[PDB]
């Protein structure tokens, strides 16, 4: 159901669920949920639509980035870490984890990518850590004009409201 | 390859790393400030050293990328802001020499001792005793000896260091292809943009003087009234028409005249509103005070404070005995964390200071969406100017009656308004000539126009030409008079105060004019009026992403500084002064001095 360990963005967790029926109707009197949206349906067609062969994508992001998990919404990480399709719409559910994933001394176990050659197609996953060079010439780091493509977020406890670790699950 | 991609990647990397280093340093500093020990200083110094090392190593490393070939204004502005770093372009030995000179200067200023008037054992320093003796004494000799002794110590202890430091700073500035250090200081107001929106730094001297000639008549109308009201205090010591002696201004140097209200009062038979009472009787506290401040701010249309502000920020003296300074301040630590550190009380000054600090925090949250290198004010005056209009609006009797701290049948008495206006003018107006003088003298020193052996004398000349203050004792070239000031011993800019003072009244006039308020401007309260808040927020969000001329144009409508609102604010005070002064107000002539 739920796990105490969550992966990062460019290592997002993918789960395939089949032959199962879920309701999650507790969302009426559920103040625990920070944000909940549905794009494909507005729960009107839920009566005549059974769930089968669904995908669950899980990761941890920043608050200001939760709006980026949607069709369009260029942003920065929506084109380099996780790209949303235009047609296949499910639902998005993001909740706050300030009290468990944030420590007063620091938490640097979550990474993200901000440099790439070319755009990202939907369902494209990039893992390889190759040095990034803006003008070809395969570099030998740490030579000049030869940067690293990765960074760490650094969620702490005493941050703001949008700079907190939000756990995000997309149901497709 | 193309320069643009290189600059973009470098800027992305710099923002990436700064967003972490700055937060670590700020958190260490806050942890030290909330609890003083001998161990938190080490952590704070470690974080600060790491951040400074990274910033210095990355600042003057992209100079390989020229600033002339950039096409967007965003990337060009970021590169221009990053390139100017300072002494890092100089040799290591020169940097160490400058750092040692600065450390010696700050240390020798901080540990001043003054010991006279009796058997020499009692050392008052500055902060424990000199501020109080300046702000409370009504005796001439005590103030004179304090002034002269403090200057005769610090100036002669500091002058050679400044003499070498100006030369080395000029050489360092020349290393960066500038022409002097004063040009480097005034380069903050340099802005480039559209055809009519550009601003050259050489134009600064043209602007600042042009406005000052328009403030000269009002200031003098104040300068007379104080003088003719000191005859009652000191019988035959201050000249009927001469300049005011330097050490009788209620402060050590003369930055503010705010402590002379007790000597100069229009009508002593009537008191001021809620002066330290009715809050003991009604039973308020810090939480209610901040809640009312938040209520006032939401009634205009600006966003309310976040919960983290209530949870993390301390709002009263700690009950665990931990030692803090708790000088009130508003901290923006980055990553969306804003806090207020202030020891609360049940006085009116705390009531107004809460609103002032809440206005800076509002400005802090205004431009949090801009990129890292541009998250600042439009210039060095906007940030301080934004937070004072709230204090101006909060003190009007309309709001005090609306809250309930005043009786509903208490009318707006004739004497109270002019008392309030006089007390405000005792602080706002009197600080402008002093700032103008300080900045002009330092710029002239850095320009090299005045030779090395004619510094101090020239300084005193300006005292008689702009502000009208005469030195109480003769000073030769050995002294260093501005070295006694805190902002000069630790070198900082000064014109920001002038700019702030003009901008705040421009903003208030614009907002009230948008508020459909009929009558004088002193009874202005933007409560129950969203237009003023909308117009102000239309400017707060820009940050430093646009030249400051466009930032100012968005609310006031003009592209430069205008002084008409400031004179319009004190119009009833102006008329009252011209009616009361059947003498004086005929200027000052610079030949009368206390010693000759
Ligand atoms: Zn302030």
- Contact (Cβ atoms closer than 8 angstroms) between residue B550 and residue B193: yes
- DSSP state for residue B424 in the 8-state scheme: H
- Say whether residue A115 is in contact with chain B using an 8 A CB cutoff: yes
Q: What six digits make up the tokens of B372?
A: 């890292």
User: Which residue among A114, A152, A159 sits closest to B336, beta carbon to beta carbon?
Assistant: A159
Q: Please state, in angstroms and rounded to a whole number, the distance separating the CA atoms of residues A104 and B203.
A: 49
- Say whether residue A54 is in contact with chain B using an 8 A CB cutoff: no
**Nearest to B364, CA basis, from B405, B331, B391:** B331
A134–B9 C-beta distance less than 8 A: yes
- Say whether residue A141 is in contact with chain B using an 8 A CB cutoff: no
Residues of B in contact with A132 (CB under 8 A): 9
Q: What six digits make up the tokens of A29?
A: 């009197």
| Beta pairing partners, A156 | A103
Torsion sign (Cα): B362, B363, B369, B373: negative
Helices (H) and strands (E) in chain A, counts: 0, 7
Q: Please state, in angstroms and rounded to a whole number, the distance separating the CA atoms of residues B308 and A163.
A: 12
Residues of A in contact with B6 (CB under 8 A): 134-135, 145
**Buried/exposed B417-451: b ≥16 CB within 10 Å, e otherwise:** bbbbbbbbbbebbbbbbbbbbbbbbbbbbbeeeee
Q: Please state, in angstroms and rounded to a whole number, the distance separating the CA atoms of residues B409 and B399.
A: 14
User: Which residue among A132, A152, A161 sits closest to B308, beta carbon to beta carbon?
Assistant: A161
| B76 Cα to chain A: minimum distance (Å) | 19
User: Which residue among B1, B13, B336 sits closest to A161, beta carbon to beta carbon?
Assistant: B336
- DSSP state for residue B463 in the 8-state scheme: I
CA distances from A162 to A74, A96, B350, B454 (A): 18, 10, 31, 57
Provide the pairing of β-strand A111-113 with A54-61: unpaired
Q: Please state, in angstroms and rounded to a whole number, the distance separating the CA atoms of residues B2 and B39.
A: 49
Helix (H) or strand (E) holding B50: helix B40-59
| 3-state DSSP of B103-144 | HHHHHHHHCCCCCCCCCCCCCCCCCCCHHHHHHHCCCHHHHH
- Contact (Cβ atoms closer than 8 angstroms) between residue B280 and residue B342: no
What three-state secondary structure class fits B489? helix
Instruction: Report the number of distinct structural domains present in chain A.
Output: 1
Site of tokens 């850590």: A129
CB contacts under 8 A, B 260-319 vs A, are 306-308, 312
Binding-site residue ranges of B: 189, 356, 360, 384, 496
Binding-site residue ranges of B for Zn(2+): 356, 360, 384
Torsion sign (Cα): A72, A74, A79, A81: negative
Size of interface A-B (CB pairs under 8 A): 43
Q: Please state, in angstroms and rounded to a whole number, the distance separating the CA atoms of residues B420 and B398.
A: 14
- Complete DSSP assignment for B174-237: HHTT-S-HHHHHHGGG-B--STTT-B-GGGHHHHHHHHHHHHHHHHHHHHHHHHHTTTTTSSSS
**Nearest to B270, CA basis, from B414, B425, B423, B421:** B414
Chain-centre distance for alpha carbon B237: 33
Q: Please state, in angstroms and rounded to a whole number, the distance separating the CA atoms of residues B216 and B467.
A: 10
CA distances from B535 to B238, B357, B502, B510, B553 (A): 48, 20, 18, 9, 11
Helix (H) or strand (E) holding B61: none
Helices (H) and strands (E) in chain B, counts: 24, 4
| A160 Cα to chain B: minimum distance (Å) | 4
| B6 Cα to chain A: minimum distance (Å) | 7
C-alpha of residue B503 to centroid of ligand 1, in Å:
14
Residue A56: half-sphere exposure toward Cβ, Cα within 13 Å: 15
Furthest CA-CA distance within chain B: 79
Chain-centre distance for alpha carbon B225: 26
| Beta pairing partners, A166 | A61, A96
**Domain boundaries, position A122:** 1-172
A158–B308 C-beta distance less than 8 A: yes
| B1 Cα to chain A: minimum distance (Å) | 6
Phi, psi of B90 (to 5 degrees): -85, 175
Residues of B in contact with A161 (CB under 8 A): 306-308, 336
Other beta carbons within 10 angstroms of residue A113's beta carbon come to 20
Q: What six digits make up the tokens of B415?
A: 């004497």
Q: What six digits make up the tokens of A1?
A: 């159901």
Q: Please state, in angstroms and rounded to a whole number, the distance separating the CA atoms of residues B387 and B382.
A: 9
CA distances from B139 to B142, B243, B330, B472 (A): 6, 19, 38, 15
A115–B12 C-beta distance less than 8 A: yes
Torsion sign (Cα): A141, A142, A145, A147: positive
Q: What is the resolution of this structure in A?
A: 3.2
B16–A151 C-beta distance less than 8 A: yes
Site of tokens 């360990």: A5
- Complete DSSP assignment for A41-72: --SSGGGG----SEEEEEEEE-GGGGGGSSSS
Contacts (Cβ under 8 Å, ≥6 apart) of B86 = B172
- Which chain B residue's Cα is nearest to A164? B335
Contacts (Cβ under 8 Å, ≥6 apart) of B389 = B359, B504, B507, B508, B511
Q: What six digits make up the tokens of B485?
A: 């000031």
Contacts (Cβ under 8 Å, ≥6 apart) of B504 = B384, B385, B386, B388, B389, B392
Q: Please state, in angstroms and rounded to a whole number, the distance separating the CA atoms of residues B319 and B343.
A: 12
User: Which residue among A135, A152, A158 sits closest to B312, beta carbon to beta carbon?
Assistant: A158
**Nearest to B193, CA basis, from B80, B291, B352:** B80
Residue B401: half-sphere exposure toward Cβ, Cα within 13 Å: 11
Which of the residues of B are catalytic? 357, 487
Contacts (Cβ under 8 Å, ≥6 apart) of A138 = A131
Boundaries of every domain in chain B = 3-85, 93-170
Residues of B in contact with A118 (CB under 8 A): none
- Complete DSSP assignment for B508-559: HHHHHHTTT--S-STT---TT-HHHHHHHHHHHT-TTSS-HHHHHHHHHS-S
User: Which residue among B1, B9, B337 sits closest to A160, beta carbon to beta carbon?
Assistant: B337
**Nearest to A120, CA basis, from A12, A5, A7, A1:** A12
Provide the pairing of β-strand B469-470 with B244-245: parallel
């Amino acid at each position: 159901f739920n796990a105490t360990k969550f992966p990062s963005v460019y290592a997002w967790e993918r789960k395939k669920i089949s032959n199962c029926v879920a309701d999650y109707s507790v969302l009426y009197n559920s103040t625990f949920f920070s944000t909940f949206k549905c794009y494909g349906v507005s729960a009107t067609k839920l009566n005549d639509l059974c769930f089968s062969n669904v995908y669950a994508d899980s990761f941890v992001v920043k608050g200001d980035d939760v709006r980026q998990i949607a069709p369009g919404q260029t942003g920065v990480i929506a084109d380099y870490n996780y790209k949303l399709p235009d047609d296949f719409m499910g639902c998005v559910l993001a909740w706050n984890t300030r009290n468990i994933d944030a420590t007063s001394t620091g938490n640097y176990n979550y990474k993200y990518r901000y440099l790439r050659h070319g755009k990202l197609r939907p369902f494209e996953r990039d893992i390889s850590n190759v040095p990034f060079s803006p003008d070809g010439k395969p570099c030998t780091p740490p030579a000049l004009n030869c940067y690293w493509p990765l960074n760490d977020y650094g969620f702490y406890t005493t941050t703001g409201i949008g700079y907190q670790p939000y756990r995000v699950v997309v149901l497709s | 390859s193309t320069i643009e991609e290189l600059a973009k990647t470098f800027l992305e990397k710099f923002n990436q790393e700064a967003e972490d280093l700055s937060y670590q340093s700020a958190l260490a500093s806050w942890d030290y400030n909330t609890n003083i020990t001998e161990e938190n200083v080490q952590k704070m110094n470690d974080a600060e050293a790491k951040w400074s090392a990274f910033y210095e190593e990355q600042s003057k490393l992209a100079k390989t990328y020229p600033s002339q070939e950039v096409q967007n204004l965003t990337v060009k502005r970021q590169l221009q802001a990053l390139q100017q770093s300072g002494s890092s372009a100089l040799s290591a030995d020169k940097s160490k020499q400058l750092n040692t000179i600065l450390s010696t200067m700050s240390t020798i200023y901080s540990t001043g001792k003054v010991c006279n008037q009796s058997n020499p054992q009692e050392c008052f320093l500055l902060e424990p005793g000199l501020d109080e003796i300046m702000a409370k004494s009504t005796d001439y000799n005590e103030r004179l000896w304090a002034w002269e002794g403090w200057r005769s110590v610090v100036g002669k202890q500091l002058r050679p260091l400044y003499e070498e430091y100006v030369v080395l700073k000029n050489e360092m500035a020349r290393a960066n292809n500038y022409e002097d250090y004063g040009d480097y200081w005034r380069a903050d107001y340099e802005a480039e943009g559209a055809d009519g929106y550009d601003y050259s730094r050489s134009q600064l001297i043209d602007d600042v003087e042009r406005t000052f000639s328009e403030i000269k008549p009002l200031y003098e109308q104040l300068h007379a009234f104080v003088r003719t009201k000191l005859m009652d205090a000191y019988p035959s010591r201050i000249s009927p028409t001469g300049c005011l002696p330097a050490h009788l201004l209620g402060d050590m140097w003369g930055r503010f005249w705010t402590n002379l209200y007790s000597l100069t009062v229009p009508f002593g038979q009537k008191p001021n509103i809620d002066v330290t009472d009715t809050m003991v009787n009604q039973g308020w506290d810090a939480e209610r005070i901040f809640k009312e401040a938040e209520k006032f701010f939401v009634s205009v249309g600006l966003p309310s404070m976040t919960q983290g502000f209530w949870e993390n920020s301390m709002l009263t003296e700690p009950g665990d005995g931990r030692k803090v300074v708790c000088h009130p301040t508003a901290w923006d630590l980055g990553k969306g964390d804003f806090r207020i550190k202030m020891c609360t009380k049940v006085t009116m000054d705390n009531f107004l200071t809460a609103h002032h600090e809440m206005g800076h925090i509002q400005y802090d949250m205004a431009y949090a969406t801009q990129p890292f290198l541009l998250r600042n004010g439009a210039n060095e005056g906007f940030h301080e100017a934004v937070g004072e209009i709230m204090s101006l609006s909060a003190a009007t009797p309309e709001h005090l009656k609306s809250i309930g701290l005043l009786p509903y049948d208490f009318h707006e008495d004739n004497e109270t308004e002019i008392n309030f206006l006089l007390k405000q003018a005792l602080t706002i107006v009197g600080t402008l000539p002093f700032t103008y003088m300080l900045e002009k003298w330092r710029w002239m020193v850095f320009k090299g126009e005045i030779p090395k052996e004619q510094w101090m004398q020239k300084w005193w000349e300006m005292k008689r030409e702009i502000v009208g203050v005469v030195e109480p004792m003769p000073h030769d070239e050995t002294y260093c008079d501005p070295a006694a000031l805190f902002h000069v011993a630790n070198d900082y800019s000064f014109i920001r105060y002038y700019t702030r003072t003009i901008y705040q009244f421009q903003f208030q006039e614009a907002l009230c004019q948008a508020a459909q308020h009929e009558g004088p401007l002193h009874k202005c309260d933007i409560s129950n009026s969203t237009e003023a808040g909308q117009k102000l927020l239309n400017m707060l969000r820009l940050g430093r992403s646009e030249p400051w001329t466009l930032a100012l144009e968005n609310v006031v409508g003009a592209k430069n500084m205008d002084v008409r609102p400031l004179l319009n604010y004190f119009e009833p005070l102006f008329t009252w002064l011209k009616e009361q002064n059947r003498n004086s107000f005929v200027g000052w002539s610079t030949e009368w001095t206390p010693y000759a």
